[PDB]
């Protein structure tokens, strides 16, 4: 009797394995990926984006904006001492 037709019916091996699910994710995801990002934000020259550029970089954990920002509040109230005295 003639061989049956199972080997040639493939359309439930298109969901049949788990990486089909992953495939339909990364055919979208990686295809819509850019070569490099859009932009990281670091500066924009609003003149305080420069503050971010010098101090608040991705790799700058350096305490300098803190010191500067602290010193700003010291400059503020010290003048206000002379506003009240």
């Amino acid at each position: 009797v003639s061989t049956l037709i199972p080997p040639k019916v493939v359309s439930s091996k298109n969901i049949g394995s788990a990486p089909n699910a992953k495939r339909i994710a990364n055919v979208v995801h990686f295809y819509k990926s850019l070569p490099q990002g859009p932009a990281p934000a670091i500066k924009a020259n609003t003149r305080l984006a420069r503050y971010k550029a010098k101090y608040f970089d991705g790799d700058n954990a350096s305490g300098k904006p803190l010191w500067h920002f602290a010193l700003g509040i010291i400059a503020f109230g010290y003048s206000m001492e002379y506003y009240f005295h």
């Binding site: 990486p19 992953k22 990364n26 954990a61 350096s62 305490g63 010191w67 602290a70 010291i74 001492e81």
Partner: protein, 52 residues
């Protein structure tokens, strides 16, 4: 009077920048590395799936 207090604040920031800021740098670095490594690992993981 209050300039003595400001001198104390200056000393306080001096101790912080001496000791803590390199430690916090190292701490921040450590976590950043871990996040990044996980992230890049995930990228590897899906690349495997493509081949599979």
């Amino acid at each position: 009077d209050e300039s003595i207090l400001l001198l104390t604040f200056l000393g306080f920031t001096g101790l912080v920048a001496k000791y803590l800021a390199p430690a916090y740098k190292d701490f921040a670095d450590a976590r950043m590395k871990k996040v990044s490594d996980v992230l890049n690992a995930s990228r590897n993981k899906h690349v495997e799936a493509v081949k599979d």
